[PDB]
Amino acid sequence: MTEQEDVLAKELEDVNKWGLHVFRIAELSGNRPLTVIMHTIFQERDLLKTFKIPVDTLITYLMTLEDHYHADVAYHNNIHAADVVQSTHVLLSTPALEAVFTDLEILAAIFASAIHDVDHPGVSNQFLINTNSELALMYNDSSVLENHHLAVGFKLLQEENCDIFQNLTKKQRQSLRKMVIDIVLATDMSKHMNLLADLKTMVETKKVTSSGVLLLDNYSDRIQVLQNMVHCADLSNPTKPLQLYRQWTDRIMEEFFRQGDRERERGMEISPMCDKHNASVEKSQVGFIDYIVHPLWETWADLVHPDAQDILDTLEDNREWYQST
Amino acid sequence: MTEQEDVLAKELEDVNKWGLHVFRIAELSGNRPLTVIMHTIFQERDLLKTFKIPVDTLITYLMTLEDHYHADVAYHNNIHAADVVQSTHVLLSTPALEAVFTDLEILAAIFASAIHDVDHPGVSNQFLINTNSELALMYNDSSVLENHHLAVGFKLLQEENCDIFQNLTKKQRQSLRKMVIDIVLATDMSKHMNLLADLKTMVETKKVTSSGVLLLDNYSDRIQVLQNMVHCADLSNPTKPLQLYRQWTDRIMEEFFRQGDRERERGMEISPMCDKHNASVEKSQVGFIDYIVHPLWETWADLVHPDAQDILDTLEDNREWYQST
Numbered sequence: 288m289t290e291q292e293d294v295l296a297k298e299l300e301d302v303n304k305w306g307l308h309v310f311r312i313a314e315l316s317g318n319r320p321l322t323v324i325m326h327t328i329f330q331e332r333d334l335l336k337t338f339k340i341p342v343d344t345l346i347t348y349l350m351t352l353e354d355h356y357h358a359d360v361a362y363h364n365n366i367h368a369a370d371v372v373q374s375t376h377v378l379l380s381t382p383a384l385e386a387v388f389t390d391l392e393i394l395a396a397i398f399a400s401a402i403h404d405v406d407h408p409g410v411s412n413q414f415l416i417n418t419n420s421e422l423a424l425m426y427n428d429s430s431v432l433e434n435h436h437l438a439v440g441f442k443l444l445q446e447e448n449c450d451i452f453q454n455l456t457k458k459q460r461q462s463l464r465k466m467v468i469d470i471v472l473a474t475d476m477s478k479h480m481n482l483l484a485d486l487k488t489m490v491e492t493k494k495v496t497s498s499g500v501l502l503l504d505n506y507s508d509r510i511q512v513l514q515n516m517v518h519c520a521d522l523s524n525p526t527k528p529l530q531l532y533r534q535w536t537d538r539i540m541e542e543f544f545r546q547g548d549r550e551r552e553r554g555m556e557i558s559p560m561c562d563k564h565n566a567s568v569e570k571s572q573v574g575f576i577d578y579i580v581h582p583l584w585e586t587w588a589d590l591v592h593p594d595a596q597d598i599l600d601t602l603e604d605n606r607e608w609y610q611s612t
Numbered sequence: 613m614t615e616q617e618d619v620l621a622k623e624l625e626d627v628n629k630w631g632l633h634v635f636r637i638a639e640l641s642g643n644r645p646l647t648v649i650m651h652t653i654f655q656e657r658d659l660l661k662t663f664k665i666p667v668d669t670l671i672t673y674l675m676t677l678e679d680h681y682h683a684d685v686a687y688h689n690n691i692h693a694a695d696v697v698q699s700t701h702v703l704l705s706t707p708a709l710e711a712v713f714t715d716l717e718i719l720a721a722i723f724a725s726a727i728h729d730v731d732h733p734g735v736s737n738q739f740l741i742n743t744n745s746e747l748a749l750m751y752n753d754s755s756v757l758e759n760h761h762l763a764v765g766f767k768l769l770q771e772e773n774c775d776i777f778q779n780l781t782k783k784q785r786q787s788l789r790k791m792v793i794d795i796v797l798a799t800d801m802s803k804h805m806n807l808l809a810d811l812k813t814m815v816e817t818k819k820v821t822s823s824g825v826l827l828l829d830n831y832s833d834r835i836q837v838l839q840n841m842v843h844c845a846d847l848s849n850p851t852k853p854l855q856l857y858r859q860w861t862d863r864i865m866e867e868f869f870r871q872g873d874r875e876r877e878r879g880m881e882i883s884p885m886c887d888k889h890n891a892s893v894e895k896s897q898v899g900f901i902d903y904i905v906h907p908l909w910e911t912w913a914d915l916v917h918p919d920a921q922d923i924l925d926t927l928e929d930n931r932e933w934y935q936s937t
């Protein structure tokens with residue numbers, strides 16, 4: 288009813304490609320991008336049958352997960368969530384990683400992406416520490432939000448008909464949890480430097496087949512790749528078509544400025560990039576690429592050579608655009 | 613009223629010596645050893661005046677802290693708490709560490725010792741993980757209890773007239789919290805191997821004055837010593853006079869067997885040393901000394917040479933006693 292009419296279905300076909308219009312999907316789905324993109328990817332990778340997950344349990348979980356993301360939060364919301372999911376899903380399919388990961392590992396990274404920012408208040412760990420918040424007390428000033436994201440994402444499974452893992456062996460369920468925790472905790476931005484250093488080391492001693500597919504025998508190497516993958520997905524805004532990048536930039540500044548406002552009314556030191564009266568959005572983005580995003584993606588490109596070549600070029604293009612204006 | 617009459621005051625004079633009868637103090641204080649030993653040490657080190665802490669706030673906090681330890685728990689209770697406090701307090705006074713630590717650092721280690729096991733349910737992290745408990749969900753299967761001890765110990769400050777840190781500069785309060793967190797998290801037994809390795813390295817590159825006092829210029833080295841100190845205090849039962857050691861052994865077995873019971877009724881793999889039908893208390897203690905306690909204390913003795921010589925001899929004596937019976 289008909290084919291050109293349900294535009295949602297039509298847009299959901301670009302799910303396998305880097306540059307999917309996630310905002311369009313957000314709008315057409317009724318501010319429910321995370322649910323529809325998850326279910327598409329789950330069907331696309333057959334995961335419902337592979338792990339005997341009923342569809343009406345999957346739906347019920349995703350609905351509640353999506354609810355527990357905050358709609359009124361500019362950047363760290365359900366859209367960004369769906370963005371990172373979809374981005375992970377694409378990176379899971381680059382040539383150099385074919386058949387490398389098991390269904391369970393794949394499942395872990397997607398689920399990890401799905402929950403990785405849930406219940407985000409729209410302020411940084413440091414703000415939660417400095418304001419002596421409930422959560423920073425709860426988690427002793429270390430990976431405060433990342434810990435809370437995992438707690439929320441996992442607890443929601445206990446909700447009325449929400450256990451998407453119900454029909455898994457304890458061995459699987461325990462392995463999955465181990466992996467999901469390891470990934471989400473790596474999304475903490477204060478770990479970025481170690482992750483990158485670790486990823487650089489892995490590039491030097493990488494093992495590839497005649498085809499050019501990566502050899503990762505041990506869990507230790509595999510989980511590290513997944514950690515970096517979702518971290519890259521988390522920092523992928525500047526690698527998307529400029530049209531999307533600029534909207535992601537608008538949302539991150541609106542959220543940053545909201546924090547800096549609260550920091551101002553409390554008489555605290557205003558956090559970098561949070562002062563709207565000392566703003567330089569464009570120069571900030573150039574810096575963000577030059578010291579965070581580009582060094583990361585260049586190292587990711589080395590690992591999957593040369594699958595991330597288009598991604599890397601787009602980045603250096605967008606870098607030049609923000610340098611120009 | 614009189615001097616030989618208040619036996620509590622008389623026993624509280626042995627506070628500065630290794631081998632204080634903590635059980636006697638527990639009984640004479642009305643099952644309130646932690647409060648009375650803390651207040652003695654605080655007065656002994658003048659800390660109330662040095663940090664402008666009012667006495668009736670100190671009392672009110674210690675009362676509530678002591679309450680939040682579980683009396684019905686055989687080993688991980690308020691007595692063990694007071695034991696570890698008192699043991700830390702003694703180790704803080706060995707020749708080789710004179711004037712090494714600041715009042716704030718000293719305060720941190722004692723407070724750390726005081727709270728390090730609060731609200732302990734009497735089961736291990738692993739049990740809390742394997743039973744999918746609230747806390748393991750809350751803290752994502754890593755340092756579960758240690759995290760919870762810190763949370764509880766710190767939250768109780770917010771209670772009606774309990775803020776013992778009220779009259780501290782933000783700079784101090786923030787430094788203290790940083791230190792207290794670092795210490796308590798090191799009490800996690802799964803970290804033992806790293807702590808020991810780290811301590812061994814520190815022994816090799818140790819710097820001492822002509823007097824024979826340790827030189828620790830940076831925070832990095834200082835906090836590491838405090839971490840090991842409280843960890844040693846936590847594993848000091850076998851270094852005490854046999855009279856006390858054997859009671860600590862009775863309490864740890866009663867608690868272990870209570871867990872193994874619960875594990876049995878749930879149909880789980882019974883944890884090492886928790887099966888009362890496959891028990892070998894004496895042989896277990898010999899092993900505990902040979903692979904955990906002695907390797908740790910030998911390394912601690914090297915660091916403070918030769919201050920821990922009596923401690924080390926007593927250990928090897930008690931080792932021989934459990935080997936004999």
Ligand SMILES: COc1ccc(Cc2nccc3cc(OC)c(OC)cc23)cc1OC
Nearest residue numbers: 476477479521524535536539571572575579
């Ligand atoms: C490790 O370095 C950082 C990493 C992340 C941030 C904050 C942040 N988090 C997630 C997505 C972001 C996305 C951004 O641009 C779209 C951005 O602009 C600088 C900051 C972002 C700040 C950082 O400090 C410069």
Ligand SMILES: COc1ccc(Cc2nccc3cc(OC)c(OC)cc23)cc1OC
Nearest residue numbers: 801802804846849860861864896897900904
């Ligand atoms: C790192 O190794 C361990 C450390 C601690 C434990 C459990 C434990 N915790 C605190 C105090 C203890 C005190 C004990 O003896 C009094 C004891 O007996 C083996 C076990 C104890 C078990 C361990 O496994 C063998």
Ligand SMILES: [Mg+2]
Nearest residue numbers: 403404474475
């Ligand atoms: Mg995050």
Ligand SMILES: [Mg+2]
Nearest residue numbers: 728729799800
């Ligand atoms: Mg403990």
Ligand SMILES: [Zn+2]
Nearest residue numbers: 367371404521
């Ligand atoms: Zn994110």
Ligand SMILES: [Zn+2]
Nearest residue numbers: 692696729846
């Ligand atoms: Zn303890």
